[PDB]
Amino acid sequence: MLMPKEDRNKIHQYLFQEGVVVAKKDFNQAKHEEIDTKNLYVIKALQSLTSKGYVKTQFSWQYYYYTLTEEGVEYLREYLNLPEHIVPATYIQERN
Amino acid sequence: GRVRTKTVKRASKALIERYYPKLTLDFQTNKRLCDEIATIQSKRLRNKIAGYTTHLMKRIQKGPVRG
């Protein structure tokens, strides 16, 4: 798609941080809850990210559920550059 | 109509068969009987049953009845 690196990272980064993204099917949503971009931006960004492995997508009642997968856990490691032994949804909280 | 089904009539037979001392011409007491002496899942069916294991009695008292 056509979107500036700024918005790509605000996605990409947030994906690595949370390890998870949800987002309602409604392009033209201006700003999406949480991430600071066009909703349309998120959906397609991820769609790409999935179509090359990396991430998994689920629908049901009008909402996308993107699950970051293990090979992606590497790809983001390249795109965000951060060193191996980084992070994801891969902590166990304090003692929760 | 009001033809009593087989379940009603089959139980009634089965009760008159093995409890003729005890039971009576009275449905009012035969009701209370059934409760103690028989497992039934509804009040309604129990009544439907007792009322007919009664009627059956009522005329045994004048002759026999096949079955």
Binding site: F16, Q17, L82, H85, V87, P88, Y91 | -
Partner: protein, 45 residues
Amino acid sequence: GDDKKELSAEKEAQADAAAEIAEDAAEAEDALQDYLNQQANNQFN
């Protein structure tokens, strides 16, 4: 499936069920990465 080969199905059906009882009785017992995310951007900040 045709009824000419039926026996052969019902029996493989059983066997299928028999091995679904192997699974369900053998599962009735059988036998880090630190630094975080919003931290590495506050430690290299």
